[PDB]
Design a protein around this ligand. Structure first.
Ligand SMILES: [Cl-]
Ligand SMILES: [Cl-]
Ligand code: NA
Lengths: 275, 71
């Protein structure tokens, strides 16, 4: 099972991807995911227990979380795989991904409501049930809140960091993870969420299908870093309170350890990598 | 540490105070979160840290576009 660059997808592949996701929405399986992510993003704190974000397990956790989602898709169409969005290379709104036959474009100014694509509120196929405010439609504002998305140069700058993570193992940390995540440095992952706008910029970001393509790239980045730093690996290596150590099992599964997710190749591979 | 407040912003009453800080927009609580460096974020803008819970409250009122928060 190969995850391809969203830019390389064929009309066929996009038809099966979009259809797979709408079924997940229709069955009620999709909302379960939005509800789970919100759970951790709203519970994870720098001062306390942190699993999904602002912590070293931000990468393995989203890797397993995405594994769940892709498998739910494969249960609707076993030919569908989760594609990534290299927002570094595909920076404008004229990217395939935002075409009406894929995710649709940005939202209208008046209220930020998405008007085209399969996930527009007018299709009736994409209602926002897991919300933070009364609005039930998909919203976006590509490049509205923030200038631009990270650049190839910037990404390489982060991938260059040899330390996976470092104490206090949070959003103040130095090292690869936190820079990838964004709370510090050039800022990659967080900014993308800010650049999309709409729900992606809120605690119910998975409401936007782009969430998975985005995180599929953050996932590919960790893999590319891993390749760059074979001598470097996951930390903490045990005993760290409130933090997920190499061999502890993360919530909500309580059956998977960051150690079980270091090598993605056990579950999938990418169309192409780097250098 | 952060100073409390209570003002009308773009038609809606933003206000918050220490609980460890609580923020509400038009009577409804807007879950906010403070980062290690003392900056803040909220359920309505979780990836864009701002200096204070007042700033975080104003970011929300803006993005909310008149929409009320859910309890
Ligand atoms: Cl690793
Ligand atoms: Cl691979
Ligand atoms: Na631990």
């Amino acid at each position: 099972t190969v995850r391809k660059n969203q830019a390389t997808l064929t009309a066929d592949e996009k038809r099966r991807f979009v259809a797979a996701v709408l079924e997940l929405k229709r069955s009620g399986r999709y909302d379960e995911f939005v509800r789970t992510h919100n759970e951790f993003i709203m519970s994870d704190t720098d001062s306390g227990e942190r699993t999904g974000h602002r912590s070293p397990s931000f990468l393995p956790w989203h890797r397993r979380f995405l594994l769940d989602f892709e498998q739910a898709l494969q249960s609707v169409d076993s030919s569908v795989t989760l594609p990534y969005w290299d927002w570094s290379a595909d920076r404008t709104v004229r990217a395939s991904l935002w075409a009406p036959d894929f995710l649709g474009g940005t939202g209208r100014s008046t209220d930020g409501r998405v008007m085209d694509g399969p996930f527009a509120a007018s299709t009736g196929n994409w209602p926002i049930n897991v919300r933070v405010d009364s609005r039930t439609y998909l919203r976006r504002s590509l490049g509205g809140s923030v200038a631009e998305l990270p650049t190839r140069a910037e990404v390489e700058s982060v991938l260059a960091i040899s330390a996976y993570d470092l104490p206090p193992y949070n959003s103040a940390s130095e090292g690869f993870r936190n820079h990838l995540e964004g709370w510090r440095g050039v800022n990659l992952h967080n900014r993308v969420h800010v650049w999309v706008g709409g729900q992606m910029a809120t605690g119910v970001s998975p409401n936007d299908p782009v969430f998975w393509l985005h995180h599929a790239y953050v996932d590919k980045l960790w893999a590319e870093w891993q390749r760059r730093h074979p001598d470097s690996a996951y930390v903490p290596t045990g005993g760290t309170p409130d933090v997920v150590d190499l061999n502890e099992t993360m919530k909500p599964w309580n059956t998977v350890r960051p150690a079980d997710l270091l090598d993605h190749t056990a579950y999938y591979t990418f169309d192409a990598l780097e250098h | 540490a952060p100073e409390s407040f209570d003002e009308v912003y773009k038609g809606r009453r933003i206000q918050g105070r220490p609980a460890g800080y609580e923020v509400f927009v038009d009577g409804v609580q807007l879950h906010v979160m403070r980062n290690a460096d003392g900056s803040w974020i909220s359920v309505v803008s979780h990836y864009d840290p701002v200096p204070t819970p007042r700033a975080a409250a104003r970011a929300a009122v803006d993005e909310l576009q008149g929409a009320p928060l859910l309890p």
